[PDB]
């Protein structure tokens, strides 16, 4: 019923993006320095698990070799030193269209607005993320708490001792206390990081950054679909009626 969503067009090289990927996974864009008209260098979260190091078996079956990805982000080991890598991962939204080309590849997503396709009179779609590396922060600390209207999906990217890892969090209460509850959640992993803090200087102290992806229609829940790739058996949470409103990276510690 709302205004049609503002689509964004993207030209990625086809070797760093699989055609096989399901319609509706969220995508993340990386900024190149001197040329960026050519290759957009967009990432998917399964690619981000490979660039950061049974999810691992699927992430290695889809993506083989990594040094193209290492070429796209050359300074990743310098960025994890300085906590500047979260300043480049921008959120873009879930996938809609994938026009197939040999060298290039045409990705069309949804920057903002209710998620939908464009060919017919606006057939809707859904947004999918895998259930592992996904933590519901409503069943984590659980009179009766009130039932709100709307639920928010946040994203966090956290530099643990085994490198950085990303997490997606689903809650419905508020933005001003999801930060505090997320500090309460990442308390024990923070307890494991300050072993080798003292030689290293001031810039390392940041533990992660939080953005707010969007507000999906609450009071419903989600479902549990899977991946139909050859060997997959990969469970994936799917959500409908999604409204994308990517936010800024707010720092946590």
């Amino acid at each position: 019923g709302w205004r049609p969503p503002v689509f964004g067009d993207f030209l990625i090289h086809a070797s760093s993006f699989n055609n096989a990927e399901a319609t509706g996974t969220p995508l993340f864009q990386f900024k190149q320095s001197d040329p960026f008209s050519g290759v957009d260098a967009v990432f998917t979260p399964l690619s981000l698990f490979i660039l950061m190091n049974g999810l691992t078996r699927m992430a290695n079956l889809l993506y083989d070799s990594p040094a193209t990805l290492a070429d796209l982000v050359p300074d990743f080991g310098r960025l994890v030193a300085d906590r500047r890598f979260h300043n480049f991962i921008t959120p873009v939204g879930p996938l809609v269209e994938n026009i197939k080309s040999t060298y290039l590849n045409k990705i069309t997503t949804v920057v903002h607005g209710p998620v939908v396709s464009k060919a017919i009179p606006r057939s809707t779609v859904k947004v999918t993320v895998p259930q592992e590396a996904f933590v519901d922060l409503d069943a984590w600390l659980s009179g009766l708490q009130p039932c709100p209207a709307d639920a928010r999906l946040y994203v966090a990217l956290t530099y643990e001792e085994a490198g950085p890892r990303f997490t997606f969090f689903q809650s419905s209460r508020g933005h001003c206390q999801i930060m505090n509850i997320l500090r309460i959640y990442y308390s024990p992993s923070i307890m494991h990081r300050y072993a080798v803090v003292q030689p290293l200087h001031i810039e390392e102290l940041t533990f992660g950054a939080v953005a707010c992806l969007g507000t999906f229609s609450a009071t419903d829940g989600w479902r549990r679909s899977a991946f139909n790739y050859r060997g997959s058996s990969l469970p994936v949470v799917e959500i409908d009626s999604f409204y994308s409103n990517v936010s800024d990276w707010e720092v946590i510690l």
Binding site: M179, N180, I202, T206, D248, E250, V251, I252
Partner: peptide
Amino acid sequence: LSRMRVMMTYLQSLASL
């Protein structure tokens, strides 16, 4: 410069607190 940079990164958080 770097001290001011990190304080810029942390004063953004206080609006939601």
